[PDB]
């Protein structure tokens, strides 16, 4: 049973819709509210150095075994989590609000959590934009021979645009998984290693930690400074695990959508 074709055709017919009113909430919240704007690089750069000051001062030595990894290891990974902590939560509560102001129109409601994620995608293109200015002070200048990450960038889109259907459609019917993912986004700072080296453990519990697909993309952005220009084949046994958990979430997310699509109006 392929009902997910009906969801994916709606995003094809509305690709101008998903872009044009994407940046309106970016204009609504980041601007037209206060004084001098773009705290969203000022706020995490303060917020990064707090986590270094407590965790670099337990790992003063004992850094990852390359010559470079330091803070360099850390903030190359911490780009991803800023697009998780305030992009999974507000995607979930995007359908609690505003359905009164959406159901009185005629356009498919499946697109309604998908643009607010892409509204937070431009957080990267100011934050991940200013990491090159840091990374032009490395021993390499830019490593132009390998910064090839559009594919690993596209994973964060594909994972979150799929996962915010199980947590958006099923959010409105119960209003309790909002409390769940408010803690489940918390446990995904430590269940995945944004901070330490997971090589403190044998090959069972270490290998059974990357069942979380989010750790795969962190290996992508940390390989924005390595040189592994064929980073599929060294871990090809579970890079197909990544592209099967996204298609499992997307099919199951479509199935839970269409079995409730015309009912969440008394919620």
């Amino acid at each position: 049973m392929r009902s997910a074709v009906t969801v994916l055709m709606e995003h094809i017919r509305n690709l101008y819709l998903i872009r044009r009113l994407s940046l309106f909430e970016l204009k609504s919240d980041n601007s037209n509210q206060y004084l001098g704007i773009l705290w969203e690089i000022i706020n995490p750069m303060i917020q990064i150095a707090i986590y270094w000051f407590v965790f670099g001062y337990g790992i003063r030595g004992r850094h990852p075994v390359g010559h470079i990894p330091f803070i360099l290891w850390m903030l190359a990974g911490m780009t991803v989590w800023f697009f998780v902590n305030q992009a999974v939560l507000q995607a979930s509560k995007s359908v609690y609000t505003r359905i009164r102001m959406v159901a009185q129109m005629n356009f498919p409601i499946s697109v309604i959590p998908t643009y607010v994620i892409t509204a937070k995608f431009y957080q990267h293109l100011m934050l991940l934009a200013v990491i090159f200015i840091i990374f032009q002070f490395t021993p390499y200048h830019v490593s132009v021979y390998l910064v090839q990450l559009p594919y690993y960038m596209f994973g964060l889109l594909a994972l979150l645009v799929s996962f915010s259907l199980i947590t958006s459609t099923l959010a409105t019917v119960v209003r309790d998984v909002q409390m769940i993912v408010q803690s489940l986004v918390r446990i995904l700072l430590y269940l995945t290693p944004l901070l330490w080296d997971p090589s403190h453990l044998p090959h069972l519990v270490q290998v059974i930690m990357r069942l979380n697909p989010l750790y795969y993309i962190v290996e992508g952005y940390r390989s924005a400074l390595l040189g592994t220009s064929w980073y599929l084949v060294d871990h090809a046994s579970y890079t197909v695990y990544f592209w099967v958990v996204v298609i499992l979430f997307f099919v199951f997310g479509s199935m839970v959508h269409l079995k409730f699509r015309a009912h969440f109006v008394d919620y």
């Binding site: 101008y16 819709l17 309106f24 129109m105 005629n106 015309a262």
Partner: protein, 264 residues
Amino acid sequence: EHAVIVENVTKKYKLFKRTSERLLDMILPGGYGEDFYALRNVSFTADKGDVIGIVGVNGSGKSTLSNIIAGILPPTSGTIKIDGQASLIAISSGLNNQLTGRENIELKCLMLGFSKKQIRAMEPDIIEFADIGKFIDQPVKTYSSGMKSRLGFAISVNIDPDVLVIDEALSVGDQTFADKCLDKMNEFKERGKTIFFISHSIGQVKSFCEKALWLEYGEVRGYGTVAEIIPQYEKFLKEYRAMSDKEKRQYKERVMRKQQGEFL
């Protein structure tokens, strides 16, 4: 064909005397709440019509029966089949209060669904129609209350749907804008599509409609054109307003006869 297939429509959102669901429940999903209907066994035909008024007392909600026909609430029991109908009227709704007048036109015209070349052809008429000239490049939170309604009518009129449903304004506007507004609504009457109008202004619904329902607590008490129903509707109110035989002695009984009208 015949423009509605409305048959035996019932709708119930039920009463919860205490806090929300699983207030006392177990693994069995059944709850213990008091039943309350809102619509009961509604069946009528519109035979391509021109226009149908809806009147009564707003204890019967009256917007429930509207947006059922707009296809945005699911009925509990009964089937309705129309056409490519309208989202009813998006007056004063969907306007974000942080964006300018150029922006919120691109909101709502995209929310209703129009291509990128259609919103530029439809652009300069709307600014010409609203007459808010300098304030078009200023966000809505600076506007007065009569200018949001001035603007919100201007976008959500160029729809060309099949079946319109109007709330209880029909000319929200201002003086010397309602004259533009009523002439705009004469186009839909001229074009001959169906319009479901709801009001409490008896003088306007006499001046605008041809057929008319009359709803009482979910029960359709009578449905003809205009000529006998509204005076009998006025016969009910003049009966009700005068004394209606001592509103404690009989109208408390009347509601209890009508709370008995929640069932056999």
